[PDB]
């Protein structure tokens, strides 16, 4: 009809916080409640005033707990510093112009302690293959600065993060997105993402276990690696797998670059070998995102 | 009171299919893999596998790829494990586990007995 | 298919007594970025799930008494109980969970007479 506003449907905060709430529309007089509830038997709306803007030599802003920050045309922006959990609920702009009034909703959903962030990770992390993670928190307000710090099985993970802060009608938020290469050995790792105030100290966290698709690694042992193998000797290799995500499906040997037959198995067993047994050995062990080989063992017959 | 809650005894004929809960308490349960561990009569600590629930991707012990299913409803905070054909071989206690940064947590067990 | 391998099977020792009890991995257990072992130990009662003692091989977790103590790095790796109790009497296990979860055999302690 006459009024139209644009701000956040829900700001969000905690007891001892500040909040700051974007909000413009298209005045005589302006007044903050709290859950206003009209009164038809007085006619009249009752309940908690959180801002009355009339009460003349109100003094400057900061030496306020509830500050209006906004104008006579444009701008109806709040600050509440501090934020209390008593002030959870729905804030009633009561606006007064020369002959309409209008009563506008915002809601600040007000915790007794801290929020947790929210971790967004790409569906598909692999090895050596770039992503950003990401880690999303729907608060920020100038008068209470904040950080988000990520951590690798609780230690401070070395790479940089890129913080950006969104102070809109559309959205609030502060939000950090974290760049690094993961290898074969996150996938497992406990990565934390702890929001912090200036200094460094606690007030929540949101935690995530990496999953991290990789080649299956491989670890080759054989067994006459200390001393000499001449002809007849028998001989032990082993394959052993460190990781694969996901699960893997074969186990095969190679000989200088060729598959031996029928050697399907986690172990190589050579009984009663021959010189011609003499080369480079490895084994092959297959994902369902492709092969991983060990390191070669050259075996050298003695005769 | 951060604890895994785990479904009661169960009596199941063999053939049969039994699916156990693991309920969890006072965290996040999309933050941390949710595992299974099988320890029949006698025997050690075998481990079977686990779902992550924040994409419910799961893997398993390569012997129980055809026997378990794991799964997870973010809605009730419960993890599942689902056996499929049973034999004598099933009758063991099962637990639920997850690993925190510096310790663990594991559900008080549940008794799979497989008789007609 | 990381297999870990704990010897001996079982322990008969006097009350008073030190008592070690080893787990060896086939492979390495240590992580390349915080340079922690990840194994731990476990203390096992009949008919009860078991209860952690020892994480990261090396950090006793809150409350377990001092007599408990773990070691090792790599590919081995030991439980040390300094002075045998009565009450000390149940099955240990070590537990490697870099990614999957794989189990020693376990370490049944029982009295020598």
């Known amino acids: 009809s006459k009024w139209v506003f644009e701000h956040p449907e829900t700001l969000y905060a905690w007891e001892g916080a500040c909040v700051w709430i974007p909000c413009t529309y298209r005045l005589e007089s302006f007044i903050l409640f709290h859950n206003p509830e009209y009164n038809k038997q007085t006619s009249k709306f009752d309940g908690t005033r959180l801002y009355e803007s009339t009460k003349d030599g109100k003094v400057p802003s900061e030496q306020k707990r509830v500050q209006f920050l906004g104008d006579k045309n444009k701008n109806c922006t709040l600050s509440i510093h501090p934020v209390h959990l008593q002030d959870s609920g729905q804030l009633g702009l009561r606006m007064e112009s020369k002959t309409e009034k209008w009563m506008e909703r915002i809601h600040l959903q007000v915790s007794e302690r801290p929020f947790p962030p929210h971790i967004q990770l790409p569906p598909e992390i692999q090895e050596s293959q770039e992503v950003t993670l990401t880690c999303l928190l729907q608060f920020s307000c100038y008068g209470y600065p904040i950080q988000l710090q990520w951590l690798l099985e609780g230690v401070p993970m070395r790479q940089a993060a890129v913080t950006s802060t969104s102070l809109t009608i559309k959205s609030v938020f502060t939000r950090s997105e974290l760049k690094f290469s993961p290898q074969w050995s996150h996938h497992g790792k406990i990565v934390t993402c702890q929001l912090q105030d200036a200094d460094g100290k606690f007030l929540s966290n949101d935690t995530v276990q990496l999953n991290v698709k990789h080649t299956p690694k491989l670890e080759i042992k054989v067994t006459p690696s200390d001393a000499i193998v001449r002809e007849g000797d028998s001989v032990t290799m082993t394959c052993e797998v460190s990781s694969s995500n996901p699960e893997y499906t074969t186990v095969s040997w190679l000989k200088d670059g060729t598959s031996l037959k029928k050697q399907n198995t986690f172990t190589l067993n050579l009984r009663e070998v021959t010189k011609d047994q003499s080369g480079k050995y490895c084994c092959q062990v297959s994902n369902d995102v492709g092969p991983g080989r060990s390191e070669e063992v050259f075996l050298q017959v003695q005769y | 009171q951060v604890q895994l809650v785990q479904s009661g005894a169960e009596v199941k004929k063999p053939g049969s299919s039994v699916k156990v809960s693991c309920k969890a308490s006072?965290?996040?349960?999309?933050?941390?893999?949710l595992h299974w561990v099988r320890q029949a009569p006698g025997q050690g600590l075998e481990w079977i596998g686990y779902?992550?629930?924040?994409?419910?991707?799961?893997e398993y012990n390569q012997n129980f790829k055809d026997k378990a299913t794991i799964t997870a409803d973010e809605s009730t905070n419960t993890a599942y494990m689902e056996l499929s054909s049973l034999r004598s071989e099933d009758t063991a206690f099962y637990f639920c586990?997850?690993?925190?940064?510096?310790?663990?947590?594991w559900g008080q067990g549940t008794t799979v007995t497989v008789s007609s | 298919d990381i297999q870990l391998t704990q010897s001996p099977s079982s322990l008969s020792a006097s009350v008073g007594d030190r008592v070690t009890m080893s787990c060896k991995s086939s492979?390495?257990?240590?992580?390349?970025?915080?340079?922690?072992?990840?194994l731990a130990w476990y203390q096992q009662k009949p008919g009860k799930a078991p209860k952690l003692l020892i994480y990261?091989?090396?950090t006793r977790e809150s409350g377990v008494p001092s007599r408990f103590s773990g070691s090792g790095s790599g590919t081995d790796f030991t439980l040390t109980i300094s002075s045998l109790q009565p009450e000390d009497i149940a099955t240990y296990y070590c537990?490697?969970?870099?990614?999957?979860?794989?189990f020693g055999g376990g370490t049944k302690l029982e009295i020598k007479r």
């Open positions: 586990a997850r690993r925190d940064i510096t310790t663990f947590y």
């Open positions: 006072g965290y996040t349960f999309t933050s941390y893999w």
């Open positions: 779902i992550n629930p924040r994409n419910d991707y799961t």
């Open positions: 492979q390495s257990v240590l992580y390349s970025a915080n340079h922690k072992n990840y």
């Open positions: 990261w091989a090396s």
């Open positions: 537990h490697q969970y870099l990614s999957s979860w794989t």
